Amino acid sequence: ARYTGPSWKLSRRLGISLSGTGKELEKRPYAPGPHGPGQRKKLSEYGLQLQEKQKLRHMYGVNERQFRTLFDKAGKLAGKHGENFMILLDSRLDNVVYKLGLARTRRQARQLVNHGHILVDGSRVDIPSYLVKPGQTIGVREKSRNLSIIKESVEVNNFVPEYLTFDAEKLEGTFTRLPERSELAPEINEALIVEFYSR
Amino acid sequence: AVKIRLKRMGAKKSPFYRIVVADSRSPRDGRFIETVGTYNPVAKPAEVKIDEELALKWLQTGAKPSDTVRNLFSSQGIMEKFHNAKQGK
Amino acid sequence: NIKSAIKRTKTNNERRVHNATIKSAMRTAIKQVEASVANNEADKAKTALTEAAKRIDKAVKTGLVHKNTAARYKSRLAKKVNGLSA
RNA sequence: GGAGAGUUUGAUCCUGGCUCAGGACGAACGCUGGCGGCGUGCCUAAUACAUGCAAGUCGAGCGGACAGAUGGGAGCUUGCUCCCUGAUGUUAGCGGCGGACGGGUGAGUAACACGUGGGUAACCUGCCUGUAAGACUGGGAUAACUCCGGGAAACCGGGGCUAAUACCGGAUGGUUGUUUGAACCGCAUGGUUCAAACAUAAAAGGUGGCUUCGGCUACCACUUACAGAUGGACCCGCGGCGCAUUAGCUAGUUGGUGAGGUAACGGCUCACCAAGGCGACGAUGCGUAGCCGACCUGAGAGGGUGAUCGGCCACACUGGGACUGAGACACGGCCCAGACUCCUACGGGAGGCAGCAGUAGGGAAUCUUCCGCAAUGGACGAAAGUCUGACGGAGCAACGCCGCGUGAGUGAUGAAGGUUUUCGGAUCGUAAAGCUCUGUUGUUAGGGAAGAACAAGUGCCGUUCGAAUAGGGCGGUACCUUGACGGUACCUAACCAGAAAGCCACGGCUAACUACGUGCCAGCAGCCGCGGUAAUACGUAGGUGGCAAGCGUUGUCCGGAAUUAUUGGGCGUAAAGGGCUCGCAGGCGGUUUCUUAAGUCUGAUGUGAAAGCCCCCGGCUCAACCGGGGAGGGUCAUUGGAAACUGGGGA
């Protein structure tokens, strides 16, 4: 059950301020902790290993079991290693939910996706890690669509993905293909997931 | 003789037969003669496709169904059409 | 504490008695036609061959014979009986 | 598709071990502990067992026996009993089938036991297909039933009576054996097919329906002959294990002939004869062990285990034995002996949880003495049905795997408190407060009796049988019901953030740091090693880090381990050249040329079952999981090619 962290110091010492995209601790850019204001140093190969695995895994927030099974399960696909892991670990039902302009928080859109509300493909999708392939109508679950969170997130703007496609009035959605695999260009470098989780 | 009858398989919530031809008195989930068929009880509902090109050789080569094997192979047009095989008697 | 087929036990006793009567009658008849083939007796050789033949097939044709062992016994007895009489 | 690091030195490199990071369980223990789905749970003592259910069924085989609608006559009660007939229902015994399948456990066994691949002119097969003949004439029994008896019981005995689908004569039948005449073909044995003499069976059954009451006919039966199918039996090639501090072994042994035996060859067992046979290519002997599909691990080669599901073998308290049967040497069948328990009228009897639970023991270690034939498979049936601790389910255990949650948005008022502080301050920290939202699971109340449900029975149609428009088989169409789980899953409404987070680590390997106390004391520790008053290592407190309804410790297996090395190590000095030679077996070999296919390589068929690993889809809200569609796996057989190379042969 991932929903336990603070959500300030986890990004604050996790390596990069996301997400975001301003909630990175701009008041104190150092790492969080009692011995944290001082000079930071680099790690070993396990330093970039833990920063790559904890950094790229903290963007979604799953447990190490499901994230590991997405590591080898992502490596079971075709293409390249870090690209398949990158399109897999971000094409989830909650990343497709909060990436479609659904909710203004990754945990908030997560609980909006597994709260029974955001039912997609015409039916309900009640598991926050139960994704949808390219072409499923990632809907809004119109029996409770008149809400404050959905209307406010429909009022708040954001750069919608070109792998996906939104709907603010028709109450629908879609994912046109796999997302822009190298195109989705955060700081999460997939080589550290090819090294700090490969042994 | 070899009574071509059902055989359980699947999860503990829902069983779906895959009725291969079997011996006289083999174990239930055990040895079978030469497997031909698959027909779940549920989903949606009772959709199962049988052989009828070797299953006519099984039902004609000395055999018989069970209750559910007889209703299934009489539903898929194989017991009656086999009877039209015997209709040239 | 035998639940069912204790009466199978009693049926095994009575069936064992009647079956021992027929089978032991077959063995004693086979030694009888073999004894008649012991000496150089012509008419007792053929009629006694008919005796061990009829009792032989009547024993092997129901119960404990059954087929191939009866053909072995009647075959060797036919060889001796055909030897002593031509 | 493969990652290394520490540790010998004053420093260095080699060589060399030793440990750690990773995965895994049928785990257990330590701390803690919300739920759902799917699998798992005596591995130690095959230890002994209380108690309940685990195999019954056939009235459409049989002769009863009881009750009894309905009817009959009596006495009284104006409603009853007494004696008869009888639809009807029930069952104790006879007989047929089923207890050899199913279920459990690895005790045995190092070979035909398993896996694979052949073979069987060396086997058998009840039930079931399909074919075609038959079902003729008779007999005397016997349990039941009673009358006596002996027994504590368990139980036996004896006298009278009866029947069948019980048994037993005769005809008929070849095919089933023996003799002859052949004909065709093989693998020594010989096989296939044709004819002619001696022997070998039948439920006249039952069910209905019809009829002239002589008999007719259908269905379920009985026998015989054939092939089919399913099963097992046998023989053989090859494969899978620690030991030479096991080199001898073997006398029914090695082989012959003859006889007997079983379904069958065979020293399988015997008589007689001969003196053989196995062994360094490991005999025998000790040890250990069920084997395989497979599982776990590895980049791969390999290494380890044989749980759960399946296939075969074995065993059924220990050790023998045989009967019934088609088939057992029989798990809830018998006979004997031994052990252990129970009963005893001391004369004698009774038992087998390595079936489902369950109790005691053992141990670190493993659960409910539950529901039902609704499904599937069985058994018996003409069917209706009955049995089914198989199974379908359930109950417990975080035991494993997977999924979801214990909130979310906002929030600088950077709150109080805790830790730190050169005493200005820093940290828990958008964290909390707070404004607002959501209900996953909860809690309540309804829906829903969702699927899992198909059958069997009732018409009617085509077609078969039928002397028959009866009646039936066969095959279609339509009606009625049948849910243990289960008021389960899931859906809907409301309610409340309310009930839902811990374990280990913070020098290195290795993510994670400071203070107090302790002062070689108490302690830690996987290795390196710390601790003798400033401890980033001992406890305590704040904070950090890993992980998560889980987290560490330990046990075992794999890898790291290029630290058994075929891939892929070496031997001058590190461990390692035999002191040296001669030689048998073995291992390897100059150049040209013809053949060969024994190796080498390639094509076609068979077979390597399913489930599992991988690829491609679909179904449970996704996933774990299930199902479908594929693949791959062999010194494998049978068979066709190439002849370059090793070999055979010749020059």
Curated annotation (Swiss-Prot), chain A:
The lineage of its organism: Bacteria, Bacillati, Bacillota, Bacilli, Bacillales. Changing residue 45 to K: In rpsD3; suppresses S12 mutation K55D. Residues 91-154 form the S4 RNA-binding domain. One of its GO terms (cellular component) is small ribosomal subunit. This is Small ribosomal subunit protein uS4. Residues 21-41 are annotated as: Disordered. GO terms for biological process: ribosomal small subunit biogenesis; translation. The keyword Transmembrane does not apply.
UniProtKB/Swiss-Prot annotation, chain B:
GO terms for biological process: translation. The keyword Repeat does not apply. SUPFAM superfamilies: Ribosomal protein S16 (SSF54565). The keyword Ribonucleoprotein applies. GO terms for cellular component: cytoplasm; small ribosomal subunit. Keywords: Ribonucleoprotein, Ribosomal protein. GO terms for molecular function: structural constituent of ribosome. Belongs to the bacterial ribosomal protein bS16 family. NCBIfam families: S16. Part of the 30S ribosomal subunit. This is Small ribosomal subunit protein bS16. It comes from Bacillus subtilis (strain 168). The lineage of its organism: Bacteria, Bacillati, Bacillota, Bacilli, Bacillales. The gene is rpsP.
Swiss-Prot record, chain C:
One of its GO terms (molecular function) is structural constituent of ribosome. This is Small ribosomal subunit protein bS20. The lineage of its organism: Bacteria, Bacillati, Bacillota, Bacilli, Bacillales. Pfam families: Ribosomal_S20p (PF01649). NCBIfam families: S20. It comes from the Bacteria. One of its GO terms (biological process) is translation. Binds directly to 16S ribosomal RNA. GO terms for cellular component: cytosol; small ribosomal subunit. Belongs to the bacterial ribosomal protein bS20 family.
